[model samples]
Target: EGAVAVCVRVRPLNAQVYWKTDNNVIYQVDGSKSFNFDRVFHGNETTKNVYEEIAAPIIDSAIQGYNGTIFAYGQTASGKTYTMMGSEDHLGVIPRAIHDIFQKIKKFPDREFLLRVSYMEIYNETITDLLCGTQKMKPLIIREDVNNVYVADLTEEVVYTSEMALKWITKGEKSRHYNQRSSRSHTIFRMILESREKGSVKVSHLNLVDLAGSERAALKEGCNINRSLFILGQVIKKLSDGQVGGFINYRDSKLTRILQNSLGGNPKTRIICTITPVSFDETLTALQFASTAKYMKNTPYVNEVS
Candidate 1:
């Protein structure tokens, strides 16, 4: 059975709209067109609500030895970052997830667990290790084994407590390239959990990805960013085709290559597609992508390394 969940979130209206002069642009949609999704969240909805409903179940799956992925997708300033990496007070999905994992660990004191963390980003078609710690910035490579695709030579750190994990995550977040309200790069924060008992080990991976915002073609960095997004769109189309043994081209871009498993292969996947309230064109584009993603099917089995 395929398991990919897709949801749409609309950010609060930007304050710049001149209601007295120009009509409210967002409400001017054609009356006949409408789209549906697994779930829809409006402006008033809180991040905590989104996580508890969409992300918590997937986190449970990861603890039980399954690969789980959650990504925020949409155009710039549409609250993608805010949803994934909120402020200290509002704690977004990533922080909340870390807290829950440690809570789960407390319940099984007899089992020995190993937790590893890696943070990286794809920018200008290059992969940079956010956790490199003052090391010279260099591009990372993607490699495939018989079972999965991974980043070769990437830095993976051992973490025990949620506090340590957040400290490392904050370190990596600082390394990201951000300008004003947007980041010019796509970032991925990953945690691999291993639990062992009685000669058996259960390994699971939880991937939290904040994709670079889709941008207009005229921007200097837009070429690379849009190219990767285009390839990802193709991958989603192929996955939705439902062919029993289809050729899905994940090699078109570094972003798609790393997400090959989450998109079409075996991993429980969820896409939180967001949009600005006033941008009709971009919102429609995001909706189309989310609609196609709703059809994607992936069969995930427990990754028990005996």
Candidate 2:
């Protein structure tokens, strides 16, 4: 059985750091503290290692028609993007997974496969299509059907080869809302896989979500970001506590609403919590969030619809 997996990745320290903490160690005002996770990656670990260890299994399961998700969470400049979408020298999980998926597609030559991709972002409680290629943004809405929750009127494009998929992904990546301080938006790139064989139809979804950088509740914009993230933390806490009833509130934020199914429902979810080695406060908060997330469990079943 597949369940939610959680891991922590510590970014390398740069020259601008003002702290004196060793690798994988955080020095707090109270005392020196250390944290652990399902898989803890030090600064020396490569994205390739992380992908093979954490993400490849999820991608493999998705090819079998199980919904899968990869979530990145941490503070600004904490290497969330670095770990998810790395540089040309160090390709990240998304690119590697896409390559692997295309490889798997070749194994089943007789089975017809349909691949559709969509990219969107949630900023200030508004959803915008990242692949729409428009400067003027229109508000997007979340709607649920019999199977799953989806963004209404979102652009979903059919992709054939790995090169074509990466082309569209790059176009959308350039359109994400970013500024000098940080990218104040949560981006989700979803790929829908539908396979047909004789009289059976199998469907699955792969959601790669790069969450907005979590900030302290100080400024107005920070308050909004923290509020939504706080809601997500609450949802995770409730679900980990075995309160799977109607007590949890996914509607608390657009982030949680979009991830409702992946968090507690059918998706095989993996959360990669990125943190900086220098920032003590931010690192501690991220560690706590990852700790709570370790206990999250998801029930995944093959999406075989006749």
Candidate 3:
């Protein structure tokens, strides 16, 4: 069992925190607050470096049969997407992890690997399969069987090359409900890796999430997206106590329910809290949420099937 790994990254300014105010980089302008995390980075830190430090281990464990989850949380337009979903010139964690996994699988020539991906969007408390652009592809349903929770009839595209995996993501992105604020849907891209060597089969899931910016939680209170974020905040708060038997209401939000195993369960969860250089209120709020995350703990173990 280990506490959730947390880190704070201040997106490049181009803000007040970038030039003058010290944030321990080397970082908070809201007068006073202190928090400890596994790591902290300023604007100078590149996405490449962040992946190596935080997510690379998760990828490494995925091959050895461990589920890994990485998510970016922050205020709207605060670079949450930029960190989890960067541009062509600068690749984000999803692309980087894809590349790293493919390359690592190549290292072990004897192992047979099957990589499949599914893109899901939790919009308005409804789960939609982003890979399906067809009109008939309505909101997906969540079901629970004897052992696991899954989406019914969700398109799980079998991808052979790293390039093709990325293509599926592009397809999902196109179908995403697109609005600056109103369209804030939490997108989850799941990559399941099943590897076999000498009759031993092991499988793992890598969950990369770009959460909706619920900076306006109070204003949009009762709205679909905001409600999900608000529930998540409460869930984290309850779990932040790091109790042995306290109740955590993951059922309140589809995002948390789908991620039940990852949240307080088995997966190694890494939370990257992104913040802007300016705006004390939003920055401080993001920091507070992230700080609470520090107190949570989980007993992550190897997920292997017979």
Candidate closest to the true structure, highest TM-score: 3
Clashing pairs in 2: none
lDDT of 1 by residue, 6-111 (tens): 8877777763321111121222244444677767777778999899988999888988889999999987888888899999888889998999898887778878
Q: Distance (Å) between predicted and true CA of 245, model 1?
A: 5.1
Please give the lDDT score at residue 47 for candidate 2.
94
Tens-place lDDT per residue, model 3, 83-133, is 887889999998899889998999888888999999888877888888977
Rank the models by lDDT, top first. 2, 1, 3
Candidate 3, number of clashes: 3
Alpha-carbon lDDT of model 3: 0.79
- Each prediction's RMSD over C-alphas, in Å, is 4.3, 3.0, 2.7
lDDT, candidate 3, at 263 = 72
The clash count of every prediction, one per candidate, is 1, 0, 3
Model 3 scores a TM of 0.91
List the pairs of residues colliding in candidate 3: 22-27, 23-27, 24-27
Query: TM-score of model 1 relative to the true fold?
Result: 0.89
